[PDB]
Structure formats: C-alpha cells, structure tokens
Design a protein around this ligand. Structure first.
Ligand SMILES: *[C@@H]1O[C@H](CO)[C@@H](O[C@@H]2O[C@H](CO)[C@@H](O)[C@H](O)[C@H]2NC(C)=O)[C@H](O)[C@H]1NC(C)=O
Ligand SMILES: *[C@@H]1O[C@H](CO)[C@@H](O[C@@H]2O[C@H](CO)[C@@H](O)[C@H](O)[C@H]2NC(C)=O)[C@H](O)[C@H]1NC(C)=O
Ligand SMILES: *[C@@H]1O[C@H](CO)[C@@H](O[C@@H]2O[C@H](CO)[C@@H](O)[C@H](O)[C@H]2NC(C)=O)[C@H](O)[C@H]1NC(C)=O
Ligand SMILES: *[C@@H]1O[C@H](CO)[C@@H](O)[C@H](O)[C@H]1NC(C)=O
Ligand SMILES: *[C@@H]1O[C@H](CO)[C@@H](O)[C@H](O)[C@H]1NC(C)=O
Ligand SMILES: *[C@@H]1O[C@H](CO)[C@@H](O)[C@H](O)[C@H]1NC(C)=O
Ligand SMILES: *[C@@H]1O[C@H](CO)[C@@H](O)[C@H](O)[C@H]1NC(C)=O
Ligand SMILES: *[C@@H]1O[C@H](CO)[C@@H](O)[C@H](O)[C@H]1NC(C)=O
Lengths: 596, 201
C-alpha cells in the first residue's frame, strides 16, 4: 500500500487540533503572568498538563508509518519532528526519578541562602544583595567571601545529583540511536537533504573551533590592557606577566564585563551619549516610545503593526495591586495574536529593549504562513541575532540626531568614538571565550572521555589557558564549579549564545555592503534604506522550511560560517590598541597563582 | 408604481444566527422587488465582488429568481470563494462553477458571532473521497477511511472523521475572526423574470 500520500492527511488532521490546543495553553500562560492569583494558577496547570499529555499519543501513532520510503523532503522533515519519542523511552521509574532529579536541582538552585560570618542569621540571596556585592563595590575581602561562600555552599551540594543525571540522560540519548548525548544537542544543527547543503556534527565540532583561532589578536591586546589598568588600580595585586583572579571580573562567573566601564574609562572627562534628560524634558511617555520604534521598522519595508497590538498588550506598569512579572517578553499566542509584556521606564536602555522586542515580534510575524510544525527560527541563534541587529543599528549617533534627541551641533570625534566602542567591546568579545570553553567542557563531560576524578581538576586547568582566570584559592574535586550557573541545572542549550554573536555581524556586514555608506563599520547605518529590506525579508519568511544553509544565501553569499566582521567591526579600536600596550608584554603565564 | 412587497433581504442580512459552511444555508427568493442600493452604499461590507454584471448595471437588467447562500468562514478564506480555486472550501464544502453569475458580499462579524469561551457551534469538512460537483451540498457524516484497514465506523489507527470545529474567539487577530458571507446566484430560465428594481417619477 502507498505510504507517502497517507501521511499528508494525518498531518492535516494533526495541525488543526495542535493550533487550537497550543493557543489555549498560551492564553492560559498569558493570563497567569499578567494577573497572578490563587485561582489563576491551577487552571494554567490544567491546560499545560493536558497539552503535554496530548503530545504522547500523536507521537505514538507516528511510528507505524515506516519512514524509509517517504520521498518528499517537506513531509519527511515534518514527520521527523513527530517521531521523536521523547523522555518515555525508558521504564516509568527511571523517567519519574529523572523528573524528580530535575525538579530538585531547580529547587536547590532557587533556595540559595548564605549568611555573613559575623551575623549567623543575616543571609542574602541572588536577588538585590550578594549579587550587588561583587557587581558595584570596591572591596577585596567581601568579594572573596561572597565568591567562596556561593561556590562552596551551592554547587558542592549539587554534584551528587548531577553525577547520576549525566549518566542517566546519556543512556536515554543512546536509546535514540545516537553515539553520545551532546550529539542530541548538535542534532538541531544537522541537515541531510540537498547535496552541497548538507551538514554533519563532526563538521560542526571542527568548524566552531576553527572560527575561534582568528580572533586571538583581538583578545590578547584587550586582556593585556585590562590587566595593566587593573594592576594600576589595585597596587601589588597582579603580576605583570601572570593572569588575573576571578573575583575582579564584575560578575559571579565572568559572563559579562559590562560593569568595568566606569573603572577603566580612558577619557573620563569626555561624557558619554546620554539622552535621559532630553527624553524626560518633552514628555516621552510609554506609548510614543514604542510608536517611534514602529517607524524604524516601517521605513525599511517591514510590515506595519496589527490593530490590536496596541489594545491587548500590557506595555506599562500594571499599577499597585496587580502583581505581575517584569521580564521583557514577546508573546506569540498564535492565530494572529501577538503581545508584549515589559515593565517600562523612561530610559534609553528601555528604548533599546523596546527595539529588540519589536524585532522579535517582526521575526515571529515573518513566518506566520508556514505549517504549524515549522513556525520556528531556522536554528537556535536566528531569533536572538535578529533581535540585536536592530539594537546595534538604533544606537548610532546619526539616527538619534535624526529623531531630534541630540543637539544638531554635536561634536562626535576620535576620543568619544573610541570611548563608545570600548563599552561595546567589553560586552560582546568578552563572552566568546568563556562560552566556548564551557561548551567544550560540557561536551567533553558528556562524551565520557574523562573519568570520575577529572571533572574539577581539568575545568580550571583549561580555563587558565582559554580565558586566563587563576584559582583564587586551591580546591579539591568535591566542589562543582559550573553547576552554579543558570543554564546548567535547567538543561538549556548553551552554544546558542555563541554562534548568534557571529551571525549578527555577518548580517551587519552584508547589510553594510547593501548600504553603500562610506565610513568605518561602527557607524554603518541601515535606516532609511529600502534596498536593505528585501534582502532580509527573503530570509525571514523561510522559517524552518528550507535548510539554514540556504537561508544564509539571500543575505550572505558564503554558505559557510566564517568570522569575517569581528575583525572588521573592531577595526579601528584594535589598530589603536596596538599603540596602547606599547610596553606591556601580551600573553599570560599559567604558573603564578594567589597561593603560589 | 410605488414600491410594494420588498424582498426579505432583512432576514438574510440581519438573521439571528447563520449555519455552518458544510451545510451552507440556502434561501430561495422570487416574485418581489429588490433594492441593491442599500447593499452597495453601505459601509459595513468589507468585500463586495463580481464580474458578470457591474454593480451599477445590477439595477438595470433582471433575472428569474435568486439563490441566497449564507455561511460563516475564516478571515483569509474570503478570497477562496471564486471560480477555479483550490483549497478546503472551494473543493470540499462549496464549489463555484467557471461560469458563475451573481456575486459575493462578505463582512466582519466579530462582535456578534464570537464568544469569549470559544464558539464551537461551527464546523467545516476536511476530507472527502471525491471532489464536490458544482452547486452541491453533502450532509453525510460517515466515518472516513484512509487505508485498507476495514473500520466499522470506529476511530483508531488510520480511520478519520470528516468534520472539524472552529475556534472563534474575540482575542484572535485579523484574518482569523469569523466573517459572514452571503453569495447571490441569479437564474435566467425561460420563465418570466421576477426580481428587480423600481421606477422614478
Ligand atoms: C511535498 O508536498 C508538498 C505538498 O503537496 C508540495 O508542495 C506543493 O508542490 C506543488 C508542486 O509539487 C506546488 O505546485 C504547490 O504550490 C506546493 N504547495 C502546495 C500547498 O500545494 C511539495 O512540492 C512536495 N515536495 C516535493 C515533491 O519535493
Ligand atoms: C519509540 O519507542 C518504541 C518502543 O520503545 C519503538 O518501537 C520499537 O523500536 C525498536 C527499534 O529497534 C524495534 O526493535 C521494536 O520492535 C519496536 N517496537 C514497537 C512496539 O514498535 C519506536 O521505534 C520508537 N520510535 C522511534 C522513532 O524509533
Ligand atoms: C529619512 O530620514 C529623514 C530624517 O528624519 C526623514 O525626514 C523627516 O521626515 C519627517 C516626517 O516623516 C519630517 O517631520 C522631518 O522634518 C524630516 N526630517 C528631515 C531632516 O528631512 C525621512 O522621512 C526619512 N525617509 C524615509 C523614507 O523614512
Ligand atoms: C485579576 O485576578 C483577580 C482574581 O480573580 C480578579 O479579581 C481581577 O478582576 C483580575 N483583574 C483583571 C483585570 O481581570
Ligand atoms: C500600517 O501602515 C500601512 C502603510 O502605510 C497602512 O496602510 C496601514 O493602515 C497601517 N496600519 C494602521 C493600523 O495604521
Ligand atoms: C584622532 O585621530 C586623528 C588621526 O591622527 C587625529 O588627527 C586627531 O587629533 C585625534 N583626535 C584627538 C587626539 O582628539
Ligand atoms: C401608491 O400611492 C397611491 C396613491 O399615491 C396609493 O393609493 C397606494 O396605496 C400606494 N401604494 C402602496 C402604498 O403600496
Ligand atoms: C440590519 O439592521 C440594521 C440596524 O437597524 C439596519 O441599519 C440595517 O439596514 C439592516 N439591514 C437589513 C438588510 O435589513
């Protein structure tokens, strides 16, 4: 009997009910998040568990169609997602225990409480408190105390659970005909369709590390300059040739360096581009802040906002007695319903956040016509990068001048331009090496190349040469350093925070090439340009229907993933920083330590 | 002669409730006087389209009788009602010929036909062994068969249902809110023409 045609009717039946059920779940979640009460909590669970239990029988029926004779690529790819059995491949007890271990990991991470030694009852949490201790403060004792307390009271008590979790989930991944578990994470980055566009996991592992060796000159000079300035700030605390302690990064783990700008500003007298007073002066309330950001997308050529986005969306502060969360989110409830939730304030940071969320909403609206199983980004890192593109293009002094937020006679020049570029330097190119090292360590842990004793005696042993962070105090293996992170207990893919970065600039570069605008890449603008709209719209409308390699063809000719613009966007700063460290030796010797 | 015995357009265009699309509602109107000026000049109609007779000339030449076909459909499927179109409405629920006469009015009804809890009184057909012949309604609800498995009218492995329910709601975006559609078909049999417009003094 024919097998190919009879899957089409099953898909047509499945999509209709999936749409409605997903809409009901999303509406329940939105009503809970906007308005919280003891009655609007259990109904959300009643919708969510029904949705979750609905995905186990449609998947069950999607095994009696023998997916080896299906020839059409679209139908085969659509059935590929449904055939994923999920977490029910093992016996019931193993699945229940795995769910329990995940829940207890989350709870233990969310119950962080550590008290000061002098007052055994005065505890601070990750809420405003101990987080602020090592973020905005000038003291070496309290930062060490907080770091050691956090890394010895949370993380040392989570290791025994993670030890069993890793092996259990690795066996689960092997139960789906895969060599490892990390291959499952790499699975989203796999295409096996048209020849010349195919991809493989080994090629990913080889190419994600090859695109890192080109940025070492951009990192060594930044490291040397930061170390020299911090040594000048802190006398007799850092060796002139060694590596720097972890306490002084600015965050708990060193994910971001954005808190170091005020300490290491080169042109202190020269003021930054601040528009808070100008924004306040002429009553820049919540509504027109978003109404202006709409015009930026409308001018390029992207579609105009729907009538109804201004009605349902909860744009402003809820009030006083209507408790709600304030995480900026862009909800896509489906069936033409799009909303945004964000506690707004009149700041330029909220301005950039509004532009980013508008970009997210536009991307979500782009692929609304695809089948239900294909309404996602081409991969993990396409929503976010498209998010930061607009934020990068909206902070330009030219556009701010155009909207009449700066005095027309402004005097942007050398010093302030380098000062601005330094601020964004500390954030973007300060995250790549840590992200790469953590992902490499996680993949090595999952592969099982390392025995039971080489977990905490190799993490720092490679961190010292990939980033240059020294052991403030020696420790035995009983610790567990990476476990004290947000995306390590909730089991979230973490490489999405690396490739995204590169994608941004590649797009920007191509867009700048489709800009005909003369000048350094930092000031390249995309506003007031219809030629820059169609090139992106031919890629936003594909969704997951086409392989992402072909998606990266209507914007950039090269289907590969090469680091071209990271060595271009920071083109002047580097060629200036070569004149900065004219006397300080670059590099770091991994022998000098605080204990030795 | 002053107008008397006006055709009951008020019942069709202002009814209490419209039926589904797979049992698309039929009405026969003849032997009266029609005034299409109110239909044309009204600003509440989103779509008013046809080709055989221009809207202005509709008051000039007149036909034997009219079939009013009323139903409620989605937002994007309003354009689906046209000769020579393919989909889930022009193929399996309501077929229009390639020589159609008369034409189509469609307007938004989100504030009458929608309910906050989800309106499940509307269904549409999704599967059929053979396409629908022009101007034909089918109201059977036999259990569908997909493969060679003999199903005795019971759900299971590969045996399906022909009707699926809509999910009309007020919070839906445009293009998915319910739109009320009325299609007028004009007949020109050799019997005397009955329905058309007035004279002026
Ligand atoms: C896989 O099946 C889909 C659904 O039929 C195909 O999509 C249609 O393909 C035809 C030509 O083959 C086009 O005329 C239609 O416009 C496409 N869309 C629809 C909604 O019908 C798709 O081409 C098939 N892929 C193959 C055969 O490789
Ligand atoms: C989902 O799980 C079921 C049962 O665990 C899988 O079905 C079995 O697959 C193995 C594969 O070698 C066969 O040997 C068994 O005979 C199958 N049993 C039944 C009852 O089907 C199913 O293959 C899994 N899904 C996928 C996509 O592999
Ligand atoms: C290109 O940018 C200019 C500068 O903002 C835009 O011109 C402004 O248009 C508004 C009306 O939309 C006027 O109120 C301003 O006085 C104009 N300013 C200047 C300097 O001309 C122009 O609209 C933009 N072009 C496009 C296509 O969006
Ligand atoms: C929020 O929920 C409470 C609890 O039921 C309810 O009394 C209140 O009316 C809700 N607010 C809105 C705006 O619906
Ligand atoms: C959005 O912009 C388009 C283009 O100018 C316009 O036709 C449409 O009416 C606008 N929508 C709204 C709700 O103003
Ligand atoms: C910026 O660099 C240019 C290039 O030499 C130089 O002429 C200018 O004086 C510099 N700006 C300063 C020093 O403020
Ligand atoms: C038309 O008008 C005449 C006189 O003007 C009147 O007798 C007749 O009843 C009218 N026709 C109606 C009301 O249908
Ligand atoms: C429907 O009712 C409204 C409200 O009175 C009226 O304005 C309109 O003319 C009516 N339409 C028809 C066709 O009777």
């Amino acid at each position: 009997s024919t097998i190919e045609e009879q899957a089409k009717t099953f898909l047509d039946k499945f999509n209709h009910e999936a749409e409605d059920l997903f809409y009901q779940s999303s509406l329940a979640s939105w009503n809970y998040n906007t308005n919280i009460t003891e009655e609007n909590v259990q109904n959300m669970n009643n919708a969510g568990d029904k949705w979750s239990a609905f995905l186990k029988e449609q998947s069950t029926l999607a095994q009696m169609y023998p997916l080896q004779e299906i020839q059409n690529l679209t139908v085969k790819l659509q059935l590929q997602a449904l055939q994923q059995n999920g977490s029910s491949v093992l016996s019931e007890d193993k699945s229940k225990r795995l769910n329990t271990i995940l829940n207890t990991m989350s709870t233990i991470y969310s119950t962080g409480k550590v008290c000061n030694p002098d007052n055994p009852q005065e505890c601070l949490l990750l809420e405003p408190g101990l987080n602020e201790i090592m973020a905005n403060s000038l003291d070496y004792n309290e930062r060490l105390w907080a770091w050691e307390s956090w890394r010895s009271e949370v993380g040392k008590q989570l290791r025994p659970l993670y030890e069993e979790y890793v092996v259990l989930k690795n066996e689960m991944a092997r139960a789906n005909h895969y060599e490892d578990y990390g291959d499952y994470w790499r699975g989203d980055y796999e295409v096996n369709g048209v020849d010349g566009y195919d991809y493989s996991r080994g090629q990913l592992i080889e190419d994600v590390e090859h695109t890192f060796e080109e940025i070492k000159p951009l990192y060594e000079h930044l490291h040397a300059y930061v170390r020299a300035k911090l040594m000048n700030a802190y006398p007799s605390y850092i060796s002139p040739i060694g590596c720097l302690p972890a306490h002084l990064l600015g965050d708990m783990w060193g994910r971001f360096w954005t808190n170091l700008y005020s300490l290491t500003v080169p042109f202190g007298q020269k003021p930054n581009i601040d528009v808070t007073d100008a924004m306040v002066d002429q009553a820049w309330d919540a509504q027109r802040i978003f109404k202006e950001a709409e015009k930026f997308f409308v001018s390029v050529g992207l579609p105009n906002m729907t009538q109804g986005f201004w009605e349902n969306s909860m744009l402003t502060d809820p009030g006083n007695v209507q408790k709600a969360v304030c995480h900026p989110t862009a909800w896509d409830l489906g069936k033409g319903d799009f909303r945004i939730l964000m506690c707004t304030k009149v700041t330029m940071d909220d301005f950039l956040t509004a532009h980013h969320e508008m970009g997210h909403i536009q991307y979500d609206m782009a692929y609304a016509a695809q089948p239900f199983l294909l309404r996602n980004g081409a991969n993990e890192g396409f929503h976010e990068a498209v998010g930061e593109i607009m934020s990068l293009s909206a902070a330009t002094p030219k556009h701010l001048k155009s909207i009449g937020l700066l005095s027309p006679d402004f005097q942007e020049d050398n010093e302030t331009e380098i000062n601005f570029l330094l601020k964004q330097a500390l954030t973007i190119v300060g995250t790549l090496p840590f992200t790469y090292m953590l992902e490499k360590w996680r993949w090595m842990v999952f592969k099982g190349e390392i025995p039971k004793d080489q977990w905490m005696k190799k993490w720092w042993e490679m961190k010292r040469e990939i980033v240059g962070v020294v052991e403030p105090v020696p420790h035995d293996e009983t610790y567990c350093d990476p476990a004290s992170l947000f995306h390590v207990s909730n089991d979230y893919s973490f490489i999405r925070y690396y490739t995204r970065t590169l994608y941004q600039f590649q797009f920007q570069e191509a867009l700048c090439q489709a800009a005909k605008h003369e000048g350094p890449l930092h000031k390249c603008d995309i506003s007031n340009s219809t030629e820059a709209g169609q090139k992106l719209f031919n890629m936003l409308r594909l969704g997951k229907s086409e392989p992402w390699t072909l998606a990266l063809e209507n914007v950039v000719g090269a289907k590969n993933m090469n680091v071209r613009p990271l060595l271009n966007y920071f083109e002047p700063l580097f060629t200036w920083l070569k004149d900065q460290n004219k006397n300080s030796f670059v590099g770091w010797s991994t022998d000098w330590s605080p204990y030795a | 002669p002053n107008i008397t015995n006006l055709c009951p357009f008020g019942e069709v265009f202002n009814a209490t409730r419209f039926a589904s699309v797979y049992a698309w509602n039929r009405k026969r109107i003849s032997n009266c006087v029609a005034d299409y000026s109110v239909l044309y000049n009204s600003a509440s109609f989103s779509t008013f389209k046809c080709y055989g007779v221009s809207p202005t000339k509709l008051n000039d030449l007149c036909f034997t009788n009219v079939y009013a076909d009323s139903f409620v459909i989605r937002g994007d499927e309003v354009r689906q009602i046209a000769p020579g179109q393919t989909g889930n409405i022009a193929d399996y629920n309501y077929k229009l010929p390639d020589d159609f006469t008369g034409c189509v009015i469609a307007w938004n009804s989100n504030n009458l036909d929608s309910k906050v809890g989800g309106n499940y009184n509307y269904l549409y057909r999704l599967f059929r062994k053979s396409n629908l012949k022009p101007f034909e309604r089918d109201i059977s609800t036999e259990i569908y068969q997909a493969g060679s498995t003999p199903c005795n009218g019971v759900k299971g492995f590969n045996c399906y249902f022909p009707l699926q329910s809509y999910g009309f709601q007020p919070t839906y975006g445009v293009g998915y809110q319910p739109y009320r559609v009325v299609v007028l078909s004009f007949e020109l049999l050799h019997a005397p023409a009955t329905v058309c417009g007035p004279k002026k003094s």
